[PDB]
Amino acid sequence: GSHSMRYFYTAVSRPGRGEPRFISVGYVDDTQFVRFDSDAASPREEPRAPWIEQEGPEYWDRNTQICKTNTQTDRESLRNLRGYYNQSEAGSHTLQWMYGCDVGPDGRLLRGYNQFAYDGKDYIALNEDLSSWTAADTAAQITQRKWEAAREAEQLRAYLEGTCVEWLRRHLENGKETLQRADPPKTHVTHHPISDHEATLRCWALGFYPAEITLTWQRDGEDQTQDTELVETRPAGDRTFQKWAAVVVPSGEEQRYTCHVQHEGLPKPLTLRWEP
């Protein structure tokens, strides 16, 4: 299928309680593979998936050095950002960074990403062209002007088209037993009487990987979008995910309702009914 490598960075200031904490994690698809935490006893790039552990000392040291330098840049940029918004030094603020690449079945670049948020709001993003910037506000325009003067987009493009895709392809091969294995959902419907005249039908999908899935209820073959309670897809803790969709049905009408499941690990979509 298609795949992605993404790195996520969070820096959080805490005035009066030391320097901003910097935590960053790396994912391939829905599998985390590294972390770095400036509050760790010994901050370093750490393995978080078995297949990455084979990488040599050079990998570990270079990524560690990168994260140490990034800790310092994020801290200085947080000071800049506070000034851009005329904010006092007394409050806590957040800077987030995500970048990475998506590739198709054939290993080729679909698109790259490089974007930031300040206090949970979009700040600046590299455009899909990997060449130009979109700034969310007049503060981000200051940053844009600096990064344009520095021709930073050009460095990012080289990374996203080259290094990113090359390392994703490497990770996919080293982790081929897991990263290239889709685990289909185990599915069933449960029935929960509410009152003499209604019951809940809940369609379950369990044990699936990757997280992307579609669960929908139909009544007489019509989608029940507005009448379906759909929980957020949640991690089980064993790499897999869980999800359910629930519908409130008049007593005796259960057989008019069908649950429909699509997931990459399934040859064809599944249709389920409550089976008393």
């Binding site: 790195y7 790396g26 990998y59 990168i66 840049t73 994020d74 940029s77 990374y159 990113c164």
Partner: peptide, 9 residues
């Protein structure tokens, strides 16, 4: 491998 840190904001 990770990308280099960006320039200062």
């Amino acid at each position: 491998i990770r990308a280099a840190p960006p320039p200062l904001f």
